[PDB]
Amino acid sequence: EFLGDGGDVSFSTRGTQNWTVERLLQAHRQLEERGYVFVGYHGTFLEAAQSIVFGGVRARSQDLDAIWRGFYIAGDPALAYGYAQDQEPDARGRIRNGALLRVYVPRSSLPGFYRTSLTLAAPEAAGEVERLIGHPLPLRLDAITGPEEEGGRLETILGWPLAERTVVIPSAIPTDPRNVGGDLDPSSIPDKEQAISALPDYASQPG
Amino acid sequence: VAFTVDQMRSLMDKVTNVRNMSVIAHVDHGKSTLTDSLVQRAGIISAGITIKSTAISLYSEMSDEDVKEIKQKTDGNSFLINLIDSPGHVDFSSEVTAALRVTDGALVVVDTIEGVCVQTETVLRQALGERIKPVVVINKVDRALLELQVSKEDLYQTFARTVESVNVIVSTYADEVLGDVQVYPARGTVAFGSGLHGWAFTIRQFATRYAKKFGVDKAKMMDRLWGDSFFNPKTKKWTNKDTDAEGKPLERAFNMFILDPIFRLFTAIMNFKKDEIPVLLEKLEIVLKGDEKDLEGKALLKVVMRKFLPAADALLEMIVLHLPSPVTAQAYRAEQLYEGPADDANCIAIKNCDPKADLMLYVSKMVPTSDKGRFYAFGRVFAGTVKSGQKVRIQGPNYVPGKKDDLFIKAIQRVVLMMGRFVEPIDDCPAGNIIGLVGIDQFLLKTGTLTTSETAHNMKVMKFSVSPVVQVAVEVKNANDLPKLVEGLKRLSKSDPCVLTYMSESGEHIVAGTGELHLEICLQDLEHDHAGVPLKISPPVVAYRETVESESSQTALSKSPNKHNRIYLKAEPIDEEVSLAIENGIINPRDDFKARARIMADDYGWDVTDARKIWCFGPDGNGPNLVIDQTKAVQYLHEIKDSVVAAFQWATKEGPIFGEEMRSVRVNILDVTLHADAIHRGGGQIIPTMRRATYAGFLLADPKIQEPVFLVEIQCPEQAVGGIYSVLNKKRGQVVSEEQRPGTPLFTVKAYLPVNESFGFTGELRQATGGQAFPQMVFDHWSTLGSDPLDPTSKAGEIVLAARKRHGMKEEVPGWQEYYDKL
């Protein structure tokens, strides 16, 4: 269990149940002690969050012809924050807020984390991403980080294999239930979570 | 006994032989016990739809001789008594008046030891105000003997004093027109007894007995059985002085022929003197039946007394011989019950309890049935006759013969008899009877008038309101029973028209009611019946409203997450008139946009242009908030209309000041830019945008909050009226008018009481007016506070901050910037 201790954890529109900053600091420390490292944030819907935290991240019927298929995450919680919410309305018409997740991989996989300046989603980068990872896309036991789009913030795409080997836990960064769609407010990020959120240094040259 | 629909209908045709009454009594005075006894005695049963017991049918027969003693037109020896249910506590003001308004007679229960208690005294006044004839019963006599071991003469003096108190009230508050309505034991309008043991009697009962043993026409036998009348055992003569020629005392007739017999049976039996009991019993011709013979102590007395003086009959005797039929009373009660011309074609039809005239049916209350979550109307036919299928005009509270507001010309699906818990279909029902209707639930909230005359006014309306102004959050103490709460809440709302249960965005379960008590009750019934599961209830809270005072400082703008769609809008105030118009069905969401436009344009000064572009109302798609489409040439615009509306429904249900509902907020969509492809303009994208732009607009349009305010009507003796103004001045109350009832010393103060200041109001008014005051308060209007909700120290800000904290939100209110584009 990597959730530290303190009573069952759940995801609510109300806030994440039983997940203080303090518990976060304990669970992080313990993940490092077992040789895991933090690589980014992942925002998504409550139902989804629960699944990932209790059951882990798992691909499921991907489009095999989809060369950028993977698990997207982001170093900057703000960028992740944007996906932290229902993507479609419930029957009544409500679009509730989501949750922010902290993604960790076995430190033993860093050798496969690369970076580029080109912008991911298009073909011009494909060749260069492939150049950096040593084999044609999609990514597999490797990950690429680069600008979400020209001048945008950076996103990270863990290939499905690697993704399935992550360990995800709650963030102490809450989504706002009364401002769904707003941008993450920098002062709502715990100073202590900020301390344990540096990213590893990714390679820019192939191996 | 059991009756067929025919028997009942037949019985309902002889209105001269019907009795509509209630039982005025404090619960701790055997109110429920006595009532039962009548049911267990004359309760009418019919020879799969259940309802909430509102009235009980009673049958009673009398001798052609008895029928003559009735100083009011009658016909036949059969009688139909409608026992209409009453509340337990007086606080239920509004519904107490409800039952009274449909009754003609009243069985007032007073206590032997305690006499007439304050509460019963108050209801009595009210009953008198509706011109209800009272009939008294001094209950709990046993407690006098067994406990106090009072003498025959002391107990006499007691009843004397008690009857005296009652009449002090009856004479002081009844109408001079009605004539002397005081109760007189000698005239058979006062019974004495004990609900516990199940016995009671009237002077008229012992007078029919000792009737011949003295060679008298009971007229003079009962006349002697009370007051100062004596029978010297020795001279064997009747005198009018408490002493014989020598100066020795003489026992009163009452003490001699009534109290003595009873007093001995008590002394005999409770002392277990088995030698006397049998002898004593045979003398009164009381035959124990086998098993009862071995009984002793209370067990015995209890059975002897029941065979001796059957409590049920004593009461049924006064009901028939003294309470007015729906014919005698409507003649002098009509004018008071019709809010139209005292000579109007209908008002007349009311006086004459005319079954041929245009319908005049009064709906006193809606009662919950098993058949779905539907409600059957309960009331009385004051004129004409109501029949299944008959199409009727359902005139609601706000109706006025002039306009067409609050009218619903529909057809009466089914007419049924309110046989307590069960209903029995009946073709028609002539004036003078209490009946039930099926199929009005969606036209009448609670009270109303049904007619046929197009020129018929409503009958004395009872102000009620469905405005949730007080609510609480319900939580289960033990998470396991959660589903059991989710059911009861659904059950609760189903039992009451005016209770509300819903879920906030926060996912909390809310229970909102008409007031402090109304909610209180609802919460009890939930943790005890509907859910029966232990719950965590939050403290009572007043429902506020969020509104704007002007147009948005500047245009409000928000863009979807795609950053591909934008919504430009401005918010501006709606005029209270319009809001009221919306709240009052005038401006209607379901109307023809054109017709409705014409209305707003004409009667309310709106640009027929704007009004024809209303996209939706809100919340719940019908509130006093609107979204006007003022865009110009925005391609695909209609393809995001459902989203926008949807967004609006949430924006208006929980505003940005502190989660409260919006009121009178006009949202004008000035512009919109959308992505060419629909994939990127879905609900997930527009809904949040709109919702956020609206918030932005609102926060820019000078935010303010409204508080709800009650209109309290109070009945109170000139003497205690002091306590009223006393308490009103410590609650920010505002006196609207004070009047006096011509004859009596009964003032009736009306004032405005802020709902957030009404907590524990009745309790405080109690102490203040020595308990003589009788409150009736309803929701009246929304008041816009002047102070700035944004300034924590201001008065409104104080409300806001607290509320926000309560809801565990960020202490400060969001600036418009947070919702505007982060540009």
Curated annotation (Swiss-Prot), chain B:
SUPFAM superfamilies per record: EF-G C-terminal domain-like, P-loop containing nucleoside triphosphate hydrolases, Ribosomal protein S5 domain 2-like, Translation proteins
Known outcome of mutating I679A: Leads to conditional growth defects, sensitivity to translation inhibitors, and decreased translation
One BP annotation, GO: positive regulation of translational elongation
Binding residue positions for GTP: 25-32, 139-142, 194-196
Outcome recorded upon mutating P540 to L/R: Causes resistance to fusidic acid and sordarin
GO CC terms: cytosol; ribonucleoprotein complex
Residue positions where N6,N6-dimethyllysine is found in the record: K490, K594
Known function: Catalyzes the GTP-dependent ribosomal translocation step during translation elongation. During this step, the ribosome changes from the pre-translocational (PRE) to the post-translocational (POST) state as the newly formed A-site-bound peptidyl-tRNA and P-site-bound deacylated tRNA move to the P and E sites, respectively. Catalyzes the coordinated movement of the two tRNA molecules, the mRNA and conformational changes in the ribosome.
Protein name: Elongation factor 2
Gene name per UniProt: EFT1
